[PDB]
Amino acid sequence: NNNIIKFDKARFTVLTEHLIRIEYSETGEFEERMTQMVQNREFSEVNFDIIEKEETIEIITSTVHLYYNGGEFTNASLFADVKFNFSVYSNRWYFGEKSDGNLKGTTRTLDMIDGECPLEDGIMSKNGFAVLADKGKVLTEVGDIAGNSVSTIDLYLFAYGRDYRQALKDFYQLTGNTPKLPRFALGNWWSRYYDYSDKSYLALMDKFTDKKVPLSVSVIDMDWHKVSEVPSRFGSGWTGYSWNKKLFPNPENFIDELHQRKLKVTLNDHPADGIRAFEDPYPQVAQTLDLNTELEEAAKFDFDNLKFRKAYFEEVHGPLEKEGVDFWWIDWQQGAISKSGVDPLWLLNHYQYQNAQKKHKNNIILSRYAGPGSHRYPLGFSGDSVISWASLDFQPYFTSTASNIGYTWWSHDIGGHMQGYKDAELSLRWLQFGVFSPINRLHSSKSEFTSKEPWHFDAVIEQSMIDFLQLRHQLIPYLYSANLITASEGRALVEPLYYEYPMEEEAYQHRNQYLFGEQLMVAPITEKMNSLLQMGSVEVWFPEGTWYDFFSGQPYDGKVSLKVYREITEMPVFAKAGAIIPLDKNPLKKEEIPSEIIWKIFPGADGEYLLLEEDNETKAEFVNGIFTVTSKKESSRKHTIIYGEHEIVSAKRGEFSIDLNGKEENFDWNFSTALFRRLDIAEISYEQKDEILQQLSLIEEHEKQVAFIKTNENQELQNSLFELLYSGK
Amino acid sequence: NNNIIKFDKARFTVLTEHLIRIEYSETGEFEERMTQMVQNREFSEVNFDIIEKEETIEIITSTVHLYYNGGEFTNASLFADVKFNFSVYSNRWYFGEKSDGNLKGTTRTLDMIDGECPLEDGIMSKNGFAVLADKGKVLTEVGDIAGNSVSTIDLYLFAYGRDYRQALKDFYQLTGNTPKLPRFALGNWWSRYYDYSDKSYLALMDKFTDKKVPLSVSVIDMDWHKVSEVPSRFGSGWTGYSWNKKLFPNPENFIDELHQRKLKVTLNDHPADGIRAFEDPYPQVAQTLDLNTELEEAAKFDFDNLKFRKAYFEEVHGPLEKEGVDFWWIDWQQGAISKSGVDPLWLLNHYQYQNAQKKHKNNIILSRYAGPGSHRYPLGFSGDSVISWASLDFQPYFTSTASNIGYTWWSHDIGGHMQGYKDAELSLRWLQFGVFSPINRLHSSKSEFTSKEPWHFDAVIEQSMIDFLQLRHQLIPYLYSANLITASEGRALVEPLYYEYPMEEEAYQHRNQYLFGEQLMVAPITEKMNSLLQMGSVEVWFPEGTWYDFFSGQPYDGKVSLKVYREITEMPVFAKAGAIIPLDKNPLKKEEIPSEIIWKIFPGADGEYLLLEEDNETKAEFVNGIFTVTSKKESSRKHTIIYGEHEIVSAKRGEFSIDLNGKEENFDWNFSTALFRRLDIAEISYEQKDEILQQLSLIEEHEKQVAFIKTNENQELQNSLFELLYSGK
Ligand SMILES: OC[C@H]1O[C@H](O)[C@H](O)[C@@H](O)[C@@H]1O
Numbered sequence A, B: 001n002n003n004i005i006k007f008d009k010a011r012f013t014v015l016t017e018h019l020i021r022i023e024y025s026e027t028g029e030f031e032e033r034m035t036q037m038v039q040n041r042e043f044s045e046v047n048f049d050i051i052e053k054e055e056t057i058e059i060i061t062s063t064v065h066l067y068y069n070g071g072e073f074t075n076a077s078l079f080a081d082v083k084f085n086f087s088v089y090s091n092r093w094y095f096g097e098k099s100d101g102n103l104k105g106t107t108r109t110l111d112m113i114d115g116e117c118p119l120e121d122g123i124m125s126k127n128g129f130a131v132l133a134d135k136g137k138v139l140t141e142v143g144d145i146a147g148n149s150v151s152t153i154d155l156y157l158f159a160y161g162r163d164y165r166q167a168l169k170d171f172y173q174l175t176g177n178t179p180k181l182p183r184f185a186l187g188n189w190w191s192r193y194y195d196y197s198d199k200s201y202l203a204l205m206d207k208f209t210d211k212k213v214p215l216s217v218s219v220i221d222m223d224w225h226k227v228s229e230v231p232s233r234f235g236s237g238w239t240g241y242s243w244n245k246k247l248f249p250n251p252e253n254f255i256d257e258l259h260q261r262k263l264k265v266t267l268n269d270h271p272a273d274g275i276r277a278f279e280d281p282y283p284q285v286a287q288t289l290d291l292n293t294e295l296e297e298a299a300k301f302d303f304d305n306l307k308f309r310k311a312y313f314e315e316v317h318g319p320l321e322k323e324g325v326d327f328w329w330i331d332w333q334q335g336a337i338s339k340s341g342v343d344p345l346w347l348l349n350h351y352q353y354q355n356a357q358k359k360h361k362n363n364i365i366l367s368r369y370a371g372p373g374s375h376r377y378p379l380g381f382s383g384d385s386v387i388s389w390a391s392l393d394f395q396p397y398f399t400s401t402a403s404n405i406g407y408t409w410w411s412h413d414i415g416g417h418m419q420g421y422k423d424a425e426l427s428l429r430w431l432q433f434g435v436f437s438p439i440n441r442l443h444s445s446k447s448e449f450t451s452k453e454p455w456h457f458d459a460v461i462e463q464s465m466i467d468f469l470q471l472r473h474q475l476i477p478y479l480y481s482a483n484l485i486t487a488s489e490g491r492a493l494v495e496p497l498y499y500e501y502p503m504e505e506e507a508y509q510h511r512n513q514y515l516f517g518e519q520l521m522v523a524p525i526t527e528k529m530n531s532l533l534q535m536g537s538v539e540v541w542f543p544e545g546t547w548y549d550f551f552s553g554q555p556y557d558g559k560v561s562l563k564v565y566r567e568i569t570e571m572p573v574f575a576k577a578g579a580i581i582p583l584d585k586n587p588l589k590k591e592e593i594p595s596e597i598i599w600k601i602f603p604g605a606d607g608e609y610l611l612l613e614e615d616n617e618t619k620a621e622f623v624n625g626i627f628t629v630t631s632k633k634e635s636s637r638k639h640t641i642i643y644g645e646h647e648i649v650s651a652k653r654g655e656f657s658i659d660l661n662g663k664e665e666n667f668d669w670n671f672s673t674a675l676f677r678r679l680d681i682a683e684i685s686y687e688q689k690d691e692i693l694q695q696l697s698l699i700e701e702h703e704k705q706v707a708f709i710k711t712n713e714n715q716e717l718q719n720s721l722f723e724l725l726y727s728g729k
C-alpha cells in the first residue's frame, strides 16, 4: 500500500528495489487477481523515492528511474533509465520498444528444427533491465480462467543489473516456485515411436536389465492405442484413448509387469481430435456431455469447457490410470486457437499438472512450453528435433538459456527425434549431453532405423552408451538434491556461465558451456571429431582457480580459454579444487534411496556439499584436509570416500570424520601417458608421431616444448598438444 | 489566389508549371503556416488550365494532368499523367503508390553501414515526376513547433521531367535556400576519438604545421568531458558537459592556443542523457528548471520544452562558448522518440543552427540528416561508417545522390569510422575522395590503430596524403565560390552526371562519377589496385568534347566510356578544353583571403570562371586566346597564370589582359613516357614488358598498335594499354 502509487490512469507497485509492476486502467479499477503468469504479488516492503508534480511522476530505486508523463502509455510517455553503466546508450527502456542486451529465454518447441531457432526474450539482460508483459487472463481463487484483466496493460520492469540469480529468485516469487520433481523423473527414460506388443516391450525392458542399463521410466508411444484400426470416416488414428488389443490384450497386467520392474509408466496423449464415437470411453463421455450418439457426435477437444475437462480426466484418463498409468505425456502440436483466447497447451499443462497430484505425490506431466510461468507444470518436452550435429550443437545453449525465463526442466529427445542422418558418434555425443541435462529421455521417430538402444551400435559405441546411462543413475542423488534446491530456493540445475561470472566477458562467449548444480562445469562436444586426431574438441573457458577433469583428474589452471580434445567415448566435465560430488555406489539396484554413497573429493582446497533427500539432509565438509559427514537423522547408509584417485574408506556406517592431509592428493593423469595415447590414435604419419614423442620427451624446458609444437604443420594437432602441455605445466 | 483551386475537401496550388501543392481538410480549413519542411509558398503566377465538372476536376500545366474525382484521397480518386514519354507506362502517379524511376535522395546516417544502405526517395525521377509528402508539424512566425497542420494531407507533386537543376532550385524556393558556409568549413578538419591532453593535442597541431599539412578545424571528441570519472549510479559517461580536468586543467587557455594557430574549435555533444547531478552546470540548470537537487533529479533531454532548450543553450553550451568553443558537433544516435512526434534530431539541428548564429556570422553545426528541408542546418555528419573498400565504393554515389533532396554538405569520416580492416591504400583512396567531397574531415574510432595522421603510414602513403591535404586548401577559393552559388542560386557543389547530361544513358551508369563545381569532373577509384598492374582503375564516361586529366594533362576525346588506370598516389579528375580553375598559391599561409591566386587554364576552347569572395567578385575570361582578369573592387592580390603546362605570368597585381595564342598550348604528357612508366611498375614478366615496349615503339599505325595489344593474354593490361593508345590517338 505504501509500495503502491497511482498517477493519472496508471498504477505502479514497487515490489523490490529492482521490480516494478506498471498498470493502465481506463475504468480506474486495477487488477488484484492472479493471472496465468503471476501467482503472488506479496513482497516485503522496500525503500524508494517519488518526485510527483502536476503533469509527471518519477519513481527512484537503487537501480532505476521510472518516468510517467501522463496520458496513454507510449514510447514517449512511459520510459526508465537504469542506474548502471553496462552500455554507453542502451540504459533506457521505452514502452513498446526493444533494447539490446536481452540474453533470451526459450520457445514452445523444437518440432521440425534442424539446428538453431529464434528464442523469446527472458528477464536477463547484459544491460541490466527487461520488461515482462503480463498479457494473460485472470484466474479465480482455485485457478480457473476468470476472463480479461481490468489492468488492460500490466507489465513487470526488472532492473536487477547483472544479479541474474536474484532476478530469477524474485521471478519465482512473482510467478510461483517450480514444484519438486519426484526422484524417478531423474533416471533414464526409454521411449520409441514403435508398435511394441506387451511381450516385445517387456522383453526390451528385460534386455536393458541384462545389458546393465538402469531405467526409471517406460514411455509407451501412440501405437498403444488404435491407429490403422480407426475407420477413416472418423479422421486419423493420431488421437486415441482405446488400447490396441492385438498388442496389449491385458493392459493392467502389462502395467503391473512394468511396475514389478520398478518402472513408472506414461502413455502418449494426442488430445486434439477429442473423443470420437469409435472410442472405448465414448459411451460414458457421450452420456456425461449429452452427445447425439446416433449421429456419432464427437466430444471435440475443448479445455475451456469445465464439463469436457471433467469427462477427460474422470472418464478418459481415469480408466487408464486405474489400469496403472502413472502420469501423462501431453503431446499437443495443433495450434494456439480457443474461443477464450487461452492457448490450449496452457490449459492442458495447468489442468493436467493439477489433476496429476490426485493419484501421486509431486507427480509430473511431459509437455511443450506454454509461456512465462508454465515452469509450474514440469516437465518440458521439446519435441521433434531434426537428427543432426546442428541440432545437438544448439541444444546445450537452448537448455542453459531457458533458465533465463525460469523453465529449468527441459526434456529433449536424446539423440534427436526425426529425419536428419545416421552417425553413431552424433548419437553418443547426444547421450553424453543428455546425461548432463535436466532430463535423460531416449526417444526417436517412427523409422525402423532410429532406435536409441545402445546395442543398435558397434561394440565401442554400445559400451560407452552403457557407461553414460549407468552414470546418469550414479548422478541421481546430486540431481535430486539440486531439484529440491530449484523448488525451495529458485536456483536452476543448469546455469549459463554468466550467472556465476556476470562481469567476465568470456562467460558470454561459450554458449554451450554451463554449470550443472554447484560442483560441476560441463563443456559438451557437439562437433564431429577431426579424423586426423580421432578426437572431438570444444573451446573451454576455465574461470580463475584450479579445475580437474571430473573423469581423468587432468588439471587446468584458470583463468584461461583453451581448446580441449576428447575421444568420442569421453566428455569434458570439470570440478574445482575442493569439489565434493556424491554418487550412488549401486546405480543398478532398485533402491528408493541409496543404501551406499561414494563421496568424490577433488583436492587442493576446502569445500562442502549438502545432500538433500526425501527424508534427510547429509552435510559433507572438507576443511584443512579433514572430511566430515553428518546427517539430520541417523541411518544404516554406508559411506565410501574417494580422495582424488584413492578409495580411503569403504562402506562405513553413520556419522564420522577422517584426516586426508597425508593422503595422496595427486591424481594418476600424467602428461606422458596422455601424449602417447593422443599420438597413438591419430591418423597421421608414423614419422610425425615418432618425432613428436622423441622431441617432447627430450626437451626439458616447458617454453621450448611449446616452441617445438608451434612448428607443427597440423594446426589442430598443435592445439591438442598445447592442451596437454598447458595441463602438464 | 488565381493559382489556388478548391474542389470537394481538396485544395490545389499551382506554384510553378511543374509544382502543385495538393491538400485535404475534413474541417474545410487549409494550412497557411510554414512546416518543418516548407518555409515559403510565395511563387510568381503561372498559366494553367482547369476542366471542372460536377463530380471531377483536371488541372493542366505544360508538363502534367492532375485529376481529382472527389471524396477521400485514394489511388483511384487522386492521380496524374505527365506530358512526357520517358517511359512506356510509368507516366502515371497514383496517390499512396510508388512508381519506377526515382533517382533517390539520402538517409539519416551511415552509422554501422558496411558498404551500401537503402536511401529515401528524392524529388528527381528519370520518368519526370516525384511526390514529396509534407508530414511535418506547423511552425510559428519565429519557427517554434505550433502543432498539427489543418491540412491533414499536404503533398507537393513535382513534374519537372529531367530538368533536375530547376526542380532543385524550386525545392530551395519552397523549403528555403541552403545558408552560406563560412570559409573555415572548407579546409581540413582534424578529429579522433582519442583521450588527448591539452598538451598532446597542441603538440599534434604543431606536428601538422611541421609536416606542411594545413588545418582549418580542431575537433575535440567526447574524451574532453568526464567519461570513466562518472559514477555508475548516474549511467554512462557518453553524455558530458564537464571538462576532464586531468586532460584540460585550463580549457579557455587551451582554446586560446588553438585560436592563436588560426583553428576553429568544436566539441562533441552527446545530448541524450541531459544534465545529471554530477555535472558542473547542474546547480545552475537545477535552479532554472526547479529540479529536486537532494533527490539528484536529472534535467532529462527534452528539446520540445522551451525552458530546457534555454537552459541547454545559455547555462550548458553558454559557459563552454565563453571558454572559446566556436560551434557544436551534435552527435545524436538515441532514436526518433518525443511526445510532440517531432524527431529530437530535427529539434536539435533547427534550434542549434539558429542559436549558433548569435556568437558567429554564417556559423554551422555538425549533425546527422533530419529529413527534407534539414539542408537549412549545415553541415551533414554521416557518422559511424565501417572501414572497408565497400563503404568507400558507396560514398561518392551517396554524396552526389544526396543533391536530389538538396542535402549538399555531407561530411563523411574520411578513411571510415570504425571496425573493418587496415589497408593504407584504402585510407589514401578515401582521402582522395574526401578532398573532392563537400567537406574534408579526418575522423576515426576509439582504436589505438585507426589514426588518420599521414605519418601513421609508410613514406609513399604519407607524402601522397600530405599532397592531397595541401590540395584541399588550394581548392578553398573554388569551394567557397561554389558555396556562395549553393546559397544564392540553389546549385549543388557535387552533382550527379545526369544534372548536366539528362538525356545521355551513360550519365546514369557511372554511380561514383560526378561534377565538382562547374569546371571539374571526378571519377574516384574505390577498388583495391590490381597487383599485376600496380594500379587501380574506374570506368569513366567522357561527355562530348576534349577532356584533360586535371593533374597530368593526359587528353581524352569524348564521347567515350573508357577504363582508366592510376597509381595509388594519383586520382582521375578531369577538366574540359577551356576550363579555368583558380587555386590558392599559398595554401600553408594563415590568410583570411588568398594574397595570391593561380589561374590554371586548359587550352583548346574559350571559357570563364567567376570567383565569388566575402568582399569581391573576380571574373577570368578566355576568349580567342585572350585571358582577362577583372574585379568589382581593386586589391593588392597578385595573380599567377598557368596556361596548360607553363607559368606565363607570376604575381602580377590588379586587373589585366594577356594574349596566349602563340603560347605553348600542349601539355608535356606523352604516350611514350606514360607507356614506359606503366610497364616499369607492373608485376609482370620482363619478357612481356620488353616485347610490349618494342612492338608499340616499332608499329606506326594506331589501328595496328591496338591490334597488337588486343593479342595480350592479360585482359586488364590490354585495358591499361588501350587507355594510353586512346589518349595518344
Ligand atoms: O506420438 C507420435 C509422435 O507424435 C509427435 O510427433 C510427438 O512430438 C513425438 O514425440 C511422437 O513420437
Ligand SMILES: OC[C@H]1O[C@H](O)[C@H](O)[C@@H](O)[C@@H]1O
Pocket: B192, B193, B221, B222, B268, B331, B383, B384, B444, B445
Ligand atoms: O564521441 C564518440 C563517438 O560517438 C559516436 O559514435 C559518433 O558517431 C562518433 O563520431 C564519435 O567518435
